[model samples]
Target: TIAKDALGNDVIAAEWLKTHAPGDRTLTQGLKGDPTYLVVESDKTLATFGINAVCTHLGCVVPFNAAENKFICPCHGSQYNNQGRVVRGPAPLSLALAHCDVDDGKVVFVPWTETDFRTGEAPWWSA
Candidate 1:
């Protein structure tokens, strides 16, 4: 199921977001009314990652495959690492980063910006 904010973005309490384990990632509809994903790199360090979840190859929503430790787009075999960077072909570009922050103890998202999804680097928010 999906949660929504005033503009239909997913809403998760900041305290709740902090409950996820290190390296855990999830898919959601975000601030821009687009598919988005978030990562809890480490609650111990309070690290978080946010990105547009659509596959750059075909605009399909990518879902996280925990067992595989990455995102897989069932639509066309596009795959991405936890950082939303391309892990396989068919996707020429990487996932875009969504701006996220905590407000009044809740997680909030703003418009996002695209990043190099092929670099395999950690998001800036990671600790």
Candidate 2:
């Protein structure tokens, strides 16, 4: 049975919507840290990235600030511009990019792993 709001919107079945909402975080099973994936859309494409590359100072998921052309970590106040360069610290490095590919018009990426994470090292998945 489906529950509907006064607006006739499906309220109860909306748990599906919760999962699809923008900026909502979900933990993937069988992955390290149970890392969360924040879905962001850009240019008609939806991409997922590991929020860990963000600053640990205050737990902010950096937003791509188009006005400043940079990614802003809203928690403790850190800024990272495009190109994944750290424009500020409180963060040790830039945002981490995961192994991604275009899948049926959706951007899918490999979640973070317990091991095999190094700045200069290539991902074992790519090997």
Clashes of each: 0, 0
TM agreement with the true structure for every prediction: 0.70, 0.45
Best by TM-score: 1
Model 2 lDDT per residue over 1-127, tens place: 1222224343222242444554333322112332333333443223434433334455565656656766777787788655445678777665554543344433344544434344455443334
What is residue 89's positional error in candidate 2, in angstroms? Answer: 1.6
Model 2 poorest ten-residue lDDT run: 27-36
lDDT of 1 at 81: 79
Clashing pairs in 1: none
- In terms of lDDT, model 2 sits at 0.45
Best by lDDT: 1
The sequence of per-residue lDDT tens digits that candidate 1 reaches over residues 1-127 is 2335435554656644555666656555665567666566654433344677878887878888888877888999998876777789798766777566666655666644343344645543222
User: What lDDT does each candidate get?
Assistant: 0.64, 0.45
Instruction: Please identify model 2 stretches exceeding 4 Å from their true place.
Output: 1-53, 111-127
Q: Which ten residues in a row have the lowest lDDT in candidate 1?
A: 118-127
